[PDB]
Amino acid sequence: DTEAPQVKSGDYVVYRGESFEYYAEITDNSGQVNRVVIRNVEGGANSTYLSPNWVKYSTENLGRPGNATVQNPLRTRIFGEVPLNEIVNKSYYTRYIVAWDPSGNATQMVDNANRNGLERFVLTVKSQNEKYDPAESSVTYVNNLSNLSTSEREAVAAAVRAANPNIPPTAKITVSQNGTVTITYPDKSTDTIPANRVVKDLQI
Ligand SMILES: CC(=O)N[C@@H]1[C@@H](O)[C@H](O[C@@H]2O[C@H](CO)[C@H](O)[C@H](O[C@]3(C(=O)O)C[C@H](O)[C@@H](NC(C)=O)[C@H]([C@H](O)[C@H](O)CO)O3)[C@H]2O)[C@@H](CO)O[C@H]1O
Ligand code: NA
Ligand code: NA
Ligand code: NA
């Protein structure tokens, strides 16, 4: 056996202030995989260094016959919690999944984007706003679109909240005097909703 384990990963996008969890699938022609490391490219054959330190991983059922077949691949959990203080611009971390078969053949690390989604993957860190796609709210009819009262601003925010149960509970929804909506996430990134997607009046 001189064929290394083959890996299928994916496009692993993660977001500040949020947990993430992805699975990679690993097969070997022998049907068995004994070890899995996720690592930075540098450091040579024995390195297990992986950064950022909040990237965790685990593999169940290692070292058992038939644990890594085409019909039932071995799976490695890749998971963690992204801190609020990560720098984003998106930020990118290209990483490698190395698996070993019983003969000691290890998946090779090849530095080319054409291998992305195989043993090589890109972990993309985005701001928290990018995880959400604020939904179409129920229109709030106000007296005058150029001057919402406090009660009208609160009504618009409540309609947006009711239409968006998946946004973080501690995100803050605010509405301006012309009905423009701002959603401020825990990581302090924002989404905006133009007024005429949420408010109308009967002045015409
Ligand atoms: C084999 C070896 O030791 N050579 C290293 C050389 O590999 C290393 O280059 C790194 O190569 C990897 C792919 O193998 C990436 O291309 C690294 O580029 C990026 C990345 O995608 O990982 C770009 C990205 O924009 C960077 N992110 C941020 C937030 O800055 C990351 C990031 O700096 C690193 O991932 C942190 O570990 O790097 C590329 O750097 C170079 C430089 O380390 O050194 C050779 O000797
Ligand atoms: Na093999
Ligand atoms: Na499986
Ligand atoms: Na968004």
Numbering used by the authors: 245 to 333, 335 to 449
Quote the authors verbatim:
Many streptococci adhere to protein-attached carbohydrates expressed on cell surfaces using Siglec-like binding regions (SLBRs). The conserved sialic acid-recognition motif governs general specificity while sequence diversity in surrounding loop regions allows the SLBR to select between related sialoglycans.
The resolution ranged from 1.3 Å to 2.4 Å and the diffraction quality loosely correlated with ligand affinity. In the strong and intermediate ligands, the invariant Neu5Acα2-3 Gal effectively superimposes and has similar hydrogen bonds. Biding strength may therefore be related to these interactions.
